[PDB]
Amino acid sequence: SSFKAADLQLEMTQKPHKKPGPGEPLVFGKTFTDHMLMVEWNDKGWGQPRIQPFQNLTLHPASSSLHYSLQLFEGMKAFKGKDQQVRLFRPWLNMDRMLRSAMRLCLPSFDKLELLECIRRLIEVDKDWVPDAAGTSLYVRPVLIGNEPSLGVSQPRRALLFVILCPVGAYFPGGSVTPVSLLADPAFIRAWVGGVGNYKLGGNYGPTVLVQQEALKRGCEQVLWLYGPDHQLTEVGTMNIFVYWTHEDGVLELVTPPLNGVILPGVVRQSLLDMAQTWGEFRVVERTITMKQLLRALEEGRVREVFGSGTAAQVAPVHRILYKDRNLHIPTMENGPELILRFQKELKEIQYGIRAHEWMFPV
Amino acid sequence: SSFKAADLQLEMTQKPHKKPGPGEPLVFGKTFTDHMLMVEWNDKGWGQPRIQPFQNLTLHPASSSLHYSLQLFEGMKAFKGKDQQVRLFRPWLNMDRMLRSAMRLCLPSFDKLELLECIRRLIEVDKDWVPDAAGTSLYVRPVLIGNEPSLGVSQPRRALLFVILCPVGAYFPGGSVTPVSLLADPAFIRAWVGGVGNYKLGGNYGPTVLVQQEALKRGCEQVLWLYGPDHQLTEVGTMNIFVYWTHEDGVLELVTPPLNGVILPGVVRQSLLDMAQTWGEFRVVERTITMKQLLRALEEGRVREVFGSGTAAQVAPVHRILYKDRNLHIPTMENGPELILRFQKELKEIQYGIRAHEWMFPV
Numbered sequence: 087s088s089f090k091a092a093d094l095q096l097e098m099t100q101k102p103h104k105k106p107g108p109g110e111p112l113v114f115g116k117t118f119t120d121h122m123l124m125v126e127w128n129d130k131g132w133g134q135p136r137i138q139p140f141q142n143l144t145l146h147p148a149s150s151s152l153h154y155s156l157q158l159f160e161g162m163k164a165f166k167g168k169d170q171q172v173r174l175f176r177p178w179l180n181m182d183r184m185l186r187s188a189m190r191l192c193l194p195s196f197d198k199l200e201l202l203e204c205i206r207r208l209i210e211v212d213k214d215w216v217p218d219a220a221g222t223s224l225y226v227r228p229v230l231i232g233n234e235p236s237l238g239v240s241q242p243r244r245a246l247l248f249v250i251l252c253p254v255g256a257y258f259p260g261g262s263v264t265p266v267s268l269l270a271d272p273a274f275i276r277a278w279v280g281g282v283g284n285y286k287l288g289g290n291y292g293p294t295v296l297v298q299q300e301a302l303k304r305g306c307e308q309v310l311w312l313y314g315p316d317h318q319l320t321e322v323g324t325m326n327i328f329v330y331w332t333h334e335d336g337v338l339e340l341v342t343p344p345l346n347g348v349i350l351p352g353v354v355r356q357s358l359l360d361m362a363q364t365w366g367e368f369r370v371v372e373r374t375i376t377m378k379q380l381l382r383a384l385e386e387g388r389v390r391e392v393f394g395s396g397t398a399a400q401v402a403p404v405h406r407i408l409y410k411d412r413n414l415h416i417p418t419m420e421n422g423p424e425l426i427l428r429f430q431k432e433l434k435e436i437q438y439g440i441r442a443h444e445w446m447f448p449v
Numbered sequence: 450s451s452f453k454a455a456d457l458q459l460e461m462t463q464k465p466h467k468k469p470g471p472g473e474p475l476v477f478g479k480t481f482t483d484h485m486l487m488v489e490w491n492d493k494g495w496g497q498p499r500i501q502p503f504q505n506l507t508l509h510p511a512s513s514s515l516h517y518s519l520q521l522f523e524g525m526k527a528f529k530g531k532d533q534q535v536r537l538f539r540p541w542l543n544m545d546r547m548l549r550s551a552m553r554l555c556l557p558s559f560d561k562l563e564l565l566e567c568i569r570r571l572i573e574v575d576k577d578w579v580p581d582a583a584g585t586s587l588y589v590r591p592v593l594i595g596n597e598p599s600l601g602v603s604q605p606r607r608a609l610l611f612v613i614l615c616p617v618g619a620y621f622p623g624g625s626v627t628p629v630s631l632l633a634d635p636a637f638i639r640a641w642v643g644g645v646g647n648y649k650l651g652g653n654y655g656p657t658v659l660v661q662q663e664a665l666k667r668g669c670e671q672v673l674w675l676y677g678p679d680h681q682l683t684e685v686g687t688m689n690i691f692v693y694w695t696h697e698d699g700v701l702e703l704v705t706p707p708l709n710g711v712i713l714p715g716v717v718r719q720s721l722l723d724m725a726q727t728w729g730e731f732r733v734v735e736r737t738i739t740m741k742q743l744l745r746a747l748e749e750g751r752v753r754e755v756f757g758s759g760t761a762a763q764v765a766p767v768h769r770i771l772y773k774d775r776n777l778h779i780p781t782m783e784n785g786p787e788l789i790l791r792f793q794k795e796l797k798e799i800q801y802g803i804r805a806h807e808w809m810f811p812v
């Protein structure tokens with residue numbers, strides 16, 4: 087069955103925290119708001135959802151979330167427009183992805199719309215926390231963990247779903263659009279076909295920390311994840327990858343890797359594909375990309391822009407790739423970056439309510 | 450720099466739990482002892498280790514252990530012999546495995562001997578909980594988690610190392626080995642070359658729960674994990690696999706897959722290889738086993754015994770494998786299981802102190 091937002095229990099905070107003021111640099115996922123959403127499950131079902139003050143979790147030492155990684159998360163943003171209204175970006179897609187992640191880990195189902203409604207209520211209570219400055223937003227983090235106090239590797243009979251909010255400035259300092267360099271090393275695999283790399287589970291991120299440190303040691307900010315013996319490009323860091331070029335057939339196109347089990351189905355990824363298809367100015371395609379194909383197109387000058395996508399960065403340009411000890415300059419910045427700046431402009435218009443669109447969910 | 454056992458702080462329980470009653474049944478990992486080990490880490494390094502009463506952990510909702518799976522665990526047993534002396538089985542190997550797992554997740558280093566000494570002290574305080582009945586033991590569970598209250602995927606600046614203990618009953622009730630059936634389906638992948646399946650990390654276990662349910666649905670108790678297009682046998686459930694046969698060259702041998710990156714380096718696995726090498730009665734090798742080889746060997750009646758190894762079960766015989774909807778009978782039980790019984794007899798002698806051996810660490 088499921089919990090209902092109409093059953094929502096409200097417990098307002100006693101002691102409010104100090105909201106940061108603008109002019110104070112907002113570091114990603116570090117400052118939290120006053121309230122949190124909390125919903126408990128056991129085998130007789132879901133309990134009553136509650137908005138309560140932000141507090142620590144009390145977990146039994148044998149909780150399956152801490153031993154066997156029965157944990158998943160989501161990430162979406164709420165934006166404050168010039169008309170002072172708070173809106174969420176395509177939250178239905180996040181609700182679908184979360185449900186899919188829960189099912190893969192044998193965590194309990196919930197109703198997508200009820201969760202969305204409770205998240206909405208949570209943002210309404212903490213509304214004054216959504217910043218009004220340029221390029222800032224409220225990052226919403228829903229989490230669902232297994233909470234069975236047992237060391238057996240089995241389906242949990244206890245679970246906990248919580249949501250925390252944090253003001254974020256994203257960070258491209260004053261709009262910036264500064265590029266990043268990537269380390270492409272085949273020795274490091276993020277995900278395998280028949281694995282879980284296409285789900286937003288906690289277990290796929292922990293192993294990436296060391297690889298990220300190895301990229302920094304070699305002079306790169308992020309990792310270009312390769313898969314297979316033909317070195318297919320999959321993701322940049324924990325962002326979806328896009329290449330804008332003139333393909334081998336002489337046609338100008340925007341290509342992203344297709345949804346096999348190795349790519350996380352990004353909400354910004356889908357949005358970029360939909361938006362570009364709507365224009366109809368160039369070919370928009372999901373197709374595999376190999377290092378061999380990229381190397382060749384670079385030597386031929388057929389590549390215009392390479393970039394990453396995700397909720398945190400929105401669109402992140404790429405200017406350098408380190409591959410098999412060789413440096414590869416990607417002319418993204420020297421080419422405007424024209425497409426990137428365009429995507430950025432149109433998203434901002436939809437996100438901040440400058441232009442009305444059905445992608446925004448009002449709070 | 451590491452914590453020191455000499456700095457141990459003790460805080461005894463004021464409220465002890467009741468030991469086994471209203472029931473003699475000890476289900477794996479469901480009953481906990483009175484005390485736990487707890488050691489915190491931050492910028493000024495490790496804190497002072499404390500043995501304190503068994504209590505709930507207080508975690509910040511943004512703890513990296515819960516979002517990004519910065520978590521690892523170990524598992525070993527302590528045994529009480531007839532002479533009332535509690536001993537640990539090859540704990541040095543576990544200490545090395547834990548250190549290796551910490552390093553792969555960028556969790557803080559510690560001194561292996563100091564942790565072992567602290568674990569020894571914890572078992573000494575809870576010595577009365579170590580059962581003495583036949584086939585029973587004390588399961589020791591060390592865990593190390595990242596505890597940074599941040600949503601950024603980075604190296605944690607806070608960490609928590611805790612150890613909990615639990616009395617476990619005999620895996621085979623009444624001392625008679627009962628076999629299990631395995632589902633071998635290539636669509637399911639546990640680990641990949643260049644991945645993290647050779648480390649005991651929480652993230653490798655959560656995805657196996659659904660596959661286990663799928664196995665049950667089909668009348669099998671466990672999963673035979675296959676890897677590659679050549680369908681190499683890797684592990685049985687979360688145990689190492691062994692096959693006792695006469696190879697295509699006419700030689701009687703015990704074989705197990707090599708540590709190629711997708712096999713967890715089992716302490717029991719190593720012990721069986723060492724013990725069998727010491728006898729010198731048959732060939733003992735680490736070699737790749739493919740489904741094709743097993744099928745040819747079964748058709749020629751060259752297979753004697755198939756089994757799983759791990760701390761929990763010790764030695765688990767296999768009698769059936771369901772592969773590509775076809776049932777395969779493994780004559781393990783019809784063949785004694787001679788090798789299994791022998792391995793079991795010799796382990797029990799070493800574990801319960803009947804025979805003096807350097808593998809035992811006295812508490």
Ligand SMILES: *Cc1c(COP(=O)(O)O)cnc(C)c1O
Pocket residue numbers: 161286321323324325326350351352353354355395396397398
């Ligand atoms: C979250 C995530 C993305 C981007 O998804 P968005 O919905 O666009 O935020 C891409 N790749 C990985 C690995 C991710 O975890």
Ligand SMILES: *Cc1c(COP(=O)(O)O)cnc(C)c1O
Pocket residue numbers: 524649684686687688689713714715716717718758759760761
């Ligand atoms: C723990 C474990 C084993 C067995 O190791 P032991 O040290 O023998 O307990 C085997 N396979 C997996 C996947 C494991 O996690």
Ligand SMILES: CC(C)CC(=O)C(=O)O
Pocket residue numbers: 161324325395396397398399600602
């Ligand atoms: C919190 C991060 C793991 C998610 C991310 O990198 C993104 O939104 O692009």
